[PDB]
Write a protein that binds this ligand. Sequence first.
Ligand SMILES: Cc1ccc(C[C@@]2(C(=O)O)C[C@H]2c2ccccc2)cc1
Ligand SMILES: Cc1ccc(C[C@@]2(C(=O)O)C[C@H]2c2ccccc2)cc1
Ligand SMILES: *Cc1c(COP(=O)(O)O)cnc(C)c1O
Ligand SMILES: *Cc1c(COP(=O)(O)O)cnc(C)c1O
Ligand SMILES: [Co+2]
Lengths: 321, 318
Amino acid sequence: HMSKIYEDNSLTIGHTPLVRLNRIGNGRILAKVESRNPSFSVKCRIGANMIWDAEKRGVLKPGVELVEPTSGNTGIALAYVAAARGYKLTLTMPETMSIERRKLLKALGANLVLTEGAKGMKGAIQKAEEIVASDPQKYLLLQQFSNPANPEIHEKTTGPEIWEDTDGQVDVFISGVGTGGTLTGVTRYIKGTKGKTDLITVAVEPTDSPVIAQALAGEEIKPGPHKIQGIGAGFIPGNLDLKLIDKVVGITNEEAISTARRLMEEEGILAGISSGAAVAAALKLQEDESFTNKNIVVILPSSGERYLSTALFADLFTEKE
Amino acid sequence: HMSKIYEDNSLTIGHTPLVRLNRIGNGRILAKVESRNPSFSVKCRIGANMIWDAEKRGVLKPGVELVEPTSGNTGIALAYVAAARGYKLTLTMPETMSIERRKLLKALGANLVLTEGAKGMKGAIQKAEEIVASDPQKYLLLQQFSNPANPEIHEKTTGPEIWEDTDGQVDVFISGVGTGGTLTGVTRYIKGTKGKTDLITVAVEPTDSPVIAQALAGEEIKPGPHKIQGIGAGFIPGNLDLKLIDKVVGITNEEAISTARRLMEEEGILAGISSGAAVAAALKLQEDESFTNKNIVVILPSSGERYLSTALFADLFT
Ligand SMILES: Cc1ccc(C[C@@]2(C(=O)O)C[C@H]2c2ccccc2)cc1
Ligand SMILES: Cc1ccc(C[C@@]2(C(=O)O)C[C@H]2c2ccccc2)cc1
Ligand SMILES: *Cc1c(COP(=O)(O)O)cnc(C)c1O
Ligand SMILES: *Cc1c(COP(=O)(O)O)cnc(C)c1O
Ligand SMILES: [Co+2]
């Protein structure tokens, strides 16, 4: 894309590189590095577009302050966009969110409201609702799991970049599902706008919280705890369009961690746990002869630098090592 | 640039965004965000090009391994490129190096050799030389402070990006100097290749180690300790072409840290200490009427996320 001066850092989102994996898999895995973003994750796109959309809809205007419950990369994305565009932001999250993330969020100007650790994200969602209810004219909740501006940005940026960078040669699209925006939006551009209805869209989820598989089977939703940060919220988000999914691959915590470590050591791509999960799903599909000659695009949501205090960098090296 | 599939992560360097600063300075500071790079710093460009250059020179034949003494972003850059392109890499550094940083380099496949803490960077340089001397056919030292492939990549990528993104309108170019490659290579492109000899090139350094100022004034070189990671090595590097510098601005530790905090809180640009230093220098220039109407391009070398254990994030809470 074209040379310019960006008017603020929110406008720099996307155009992330698509990199061939040469040592992991058969040479047809193409990794889309979504840590090449202004706050270093796929969420940069949705922090930008949910705020731009709120501006366009007339609900974010001078005097209105943003609120969102998030203990993750969405909080970081909303923080840098609010700072870049001159909005006040309040984030709610359980008091168990890491010091690294609190430091980042405060440095970017966010106002943090810490909720009881025992109540997890449910307690943070309740606190965000309470804050907005205290002054609904003042506060705007963005609602990342249902706000259509989330999948919209992937329809307008992420998907077009995959189509253009592969010159239409993509055959398989793999996305670990958190909010579902990435899966939904990219698939709507490729299957819908470009008419490629035989794209294979693969949802990735934790083996220990396989709610997408349960929903497609018409079974009871029964989530569980797991370590693949950023995916597997334990329900079907509003922003996940189940009708667009062709296959669901469940990944273990250990598979996700080990494959993220391989991205770093074998490909030089700093990668988070969910990036390992998505590439591990590509490797499982390449066990099946139907996939042997397909070009597989995989989203890598985050950089392993954000994971130094997590399982990803634990049980890896001995004191002596 | 042209839509494509990159054949490895080293080929994804550059095309970093130039962002107008709206609250910091007069609206004419244009910040080039060099953390938008495959290992998140300006050094990703030189990790790639020093290795590409070694390949082109025929000195990276099968069995040859890389060695470099580095405590910083160059070690992370060389590690991701060596992992991407299938080389073995040894980095030397003092044992002071944090366990978390050893884990990150380790995860990228680097072999670490930890040297005696009291001997600092000098001890790490000594150990790298000793490793190469133990088997010179096997080991290749990249020598980031003198290897011309460092400023070359900035002449071939960073410089052109600044020229294109500003439509040639860049009046002032500000770089905090570590190796000098950024300053040297960008200035060679803009003053030389593009012929814009009216460009004002500004070197930034710590007030507590003002060796560039000393060199340009013809004063004795007298370095000192400071906090501005990535700049101010306390000598004039081979890759710093002093002839290209118009002005040197010295920045305090506190000015660097406070201005980096403003980049984060006021602009939403995650920024390291040296990014704060370089922008602090732009602010000083904008106090001088001669600079008021000028477009000022400033390099932001790194992201504040790499500084979470440092004073950059101190006193954010009670
Ligand atoms: C540590 C961490 C990282 C990323 C996330 C992603 C999400 C966010 O708010 O940033 C979207 C939400 C999420 C929460 C739980 C499971 C999956 C996604 C959450 C927590
Ligand atoms: C902590 C840290 C960060 C960046 C650097 C930059 C350099 C590196 O090897 O990565 C170039 C070298 C350097 C060393 C001392 C002063 C300035 C630059 C060094 C140390
Ligand atoms: C958000 C996120 C995902 C999932 O992306 P969605 O578009 O929300 O499905 C995966 N990994 C990480 C690290 C994320 O932050
Ligand atoms: C390398 C580096 C610089 C200085 O860039 P040079 O091109 O080496 O002069 C500044 N800040 C940081 C953090 C760096 O890593
Ligand atoms: Co481009």
